[PDB]
C-alpha cells in the first residue's frame, strides 16, 4: 500500500535482574516517530521525528500513561505465558506485538494488523476480517478466550478503521516534506577482479527513501536471480537506505550484464552497466 502506521511492543523477562523490560516504538512507513523504554531513568514517551514535536502536552501524557500501564500489563502477561507452557521461573522470555493500519494511494484503509509472538514464534493474530482470531496452539487458545470475553477484536476494529487511519493521515500531512517525499537512489557499478578469468560487478543504490527498492542483474536481458548476491537493505542513519547486488562474471563478458533499479523516487527505472 501507499502508507502505513505500526507500533512495535517488546516485553522481555530477565529473572534475577529486575522486572521485565517493556519497549514501544512507533513508525510511519520507514520513519520512526516515538519511543518508550521502561528501563529509562525517567520513563516517558519521547519524540523521534521532528514532525511529531508539535503535538501538545496531552498527547504526550496520554502516550506515557498508555505505555506505563502496558509495562505492568505485559509483566502479568509474561507470568501467564510462562504458566501456559509449564516453563520454569528461571528462563528469560519475550512477548512481541505489532499492530497498525495500511492505507492505499487514495488514503483509504487497505487492511489492519494485530499480531503477537512468544519467544519469536507466532502466537496469536487478528484475522484480516478484524473480527476473529488465529491461535497457534492450546496456550494461545486461552489468550483467545480472554480476548473474546474482553471484546478485544471489536476494540481493535474500531481503532484500526478509525483513530489509526485518522492519526496516520495527520502525521502524513504534518510530516509531508519527508514522509511524502521519495528520495531516489544514487547509483553506480563497480568492478573488482577475483581471478584472471572472473570479476565481481557490484551495483550500488545509496541515499534512497523509502526502503522499498528492486535491484537486479541481467545477462543478455535475462534476470540472474540465482547468481546474484543481494545484501539486506541497511539504514544510512540520516533516514535514507543503502543496498547493493553483485554478480561474478567472466572477464571480457561485462557488457552482457545490466543492473536494473526501480524505486519510487526515480522519474523512470534505471539500466546501468559497468563503465570502465
Amino acid at each position: 500500500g501507499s502508507h502505513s502506521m505500526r507500533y512495535f511492543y517488546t516485553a522481555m523477562s530477565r529473572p534475577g535482574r529486575g522486572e521485565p523490560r517493556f519497549i514501544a516504538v512507533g513508525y510511519v512507513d520507514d520513519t520512526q516517530f516515538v519511543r518508550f523504554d521502561s528501563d529509562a531513568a525517567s520513563p516517558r514517551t519521547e519524540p523521534r521525528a521532528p514532525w511529531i514535536e508539535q503535538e501538545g502536552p496531552e498527547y504526550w501524557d496520554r502516550n506515557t500513561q498508555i505505555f506505563k500501564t502496558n509495562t505492568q500489563t505485559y509483566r502479568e502477561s509474561l507470568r501467564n505465558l510462562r504458566g501456559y507452557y509449564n516453563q520454569s521461573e528461571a528462563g528469560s522470555h519475550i512477548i512481541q506485538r505489532m499492530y497498525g493500519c495500511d492505507l492505499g494511494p487514495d488514503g483509504r484503509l487497505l487492511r489492519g494488523h494485530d499480531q503477537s509472538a512468544y519467544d519469536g514464534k507466532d502466537y496469536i493474530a487478528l484475522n484480516e476480517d478484524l473480527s476473529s482470531w488465529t491461535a497457534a496452539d492450546t496456550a494461545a487458545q486461552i489468550t483467545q478466550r480472554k480476548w473474546e470475553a474482553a471484546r478485544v477484536a471489536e476494540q481493535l476494529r474500531a481503532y484500526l478503521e478509525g483513530l489509526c487511519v485518522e492519526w496516520l493521515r495527520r502525521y502524513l500531512e504534518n510530516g509531508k516534506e519527508t514522509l511524502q517525499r521519495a528520495d531516489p537512489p544514487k547509483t553506480h557499478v563497480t568492478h573488482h577482479p577475483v581471478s584472471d578469468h572472473e570479476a565481481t560487478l557490484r551495483c550500488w543504490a545509496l541515499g534512497f527513501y523509502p526502503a522499498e527498492i528492486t535491484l537486479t542483474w541481467q545477462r543478455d536481458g535475462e534476470d540472474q536471480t540465482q547468481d546474484t548476491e543481494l545484501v539486506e537493505t541497511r539504514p544510512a542513519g540520516d533516514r535514507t537506505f543503502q543496498k547493493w547486488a553483485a554478480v561474478v562474471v567472466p572477464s571480457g563478458e561485462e557488457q552482457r550484464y545490466t543492473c536494473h533499479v526501480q524505486h519510487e523516487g526515480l522519474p523512470k527505472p534505471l539500466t546501468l552497466r559497468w563503465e570502465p
Binding site: 519475550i94 507466532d122 544510512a236 542513519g237
Partner: protein, 99 residues
C-alpha cells in the same frame, strides 16, 4: 529457537580520507534481543557510540544500528565487535570500503 545476528559495517557517506563521516554497524535478524555491539578503532573500543531504538522485522527478528562520527584515514582500521547468546566468542567484522 534462537537466531544469530547478521552484521554489516559501513559508512553513511562514501569514504574520503580526512573527511568526517559516520561509521555504522547494523545488526539484524537476531533473537533474543540482548546483544553487545562495540565499534573499534585499531582494535580499541570507541566511546560515545550510540544506537537506534529496539525494533523488529516482520519475521520477529530484531535489528539495531550502532553508529559514531569518524574520520577515515589510509592507515586506521575500523571494525565492529558483536556478542550474542548464539555466539561462542565475540564476532569481529572489519570495515571494508567496498562493502
Amino acid at each position: 529457537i534462537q537466531r544469530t545476528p547478521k552484521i554489516q559495517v559501513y559508512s553513511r557517506h562514501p569514504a574520503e580520507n580526512g573527511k568526517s563521516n559516520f561509521l555504522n554497524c547494523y545488526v539484524s535478524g537476531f533473537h533474543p534481543s540482548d546483544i553487545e555491539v562495540d565499534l573499534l578503532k585499531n582494535g580499541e573500543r570507541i566511546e560515545k557510540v550510540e544506537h537506534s531504538d529496539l525494533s523488529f522485522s516482520k519475521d520477529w527478528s530484531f535489528y539495531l544500528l550502532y553508529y559514531t562520527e569518524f574520520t577515515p584515514t589510509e592507515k586506521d582500521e575500523y571494525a565492529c565487535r558483536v556478542n550474542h547468546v548464539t555466539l561462542s566468542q565475540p564476532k569481529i567484522v572489519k570495515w571494508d570500503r567496498d562493502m
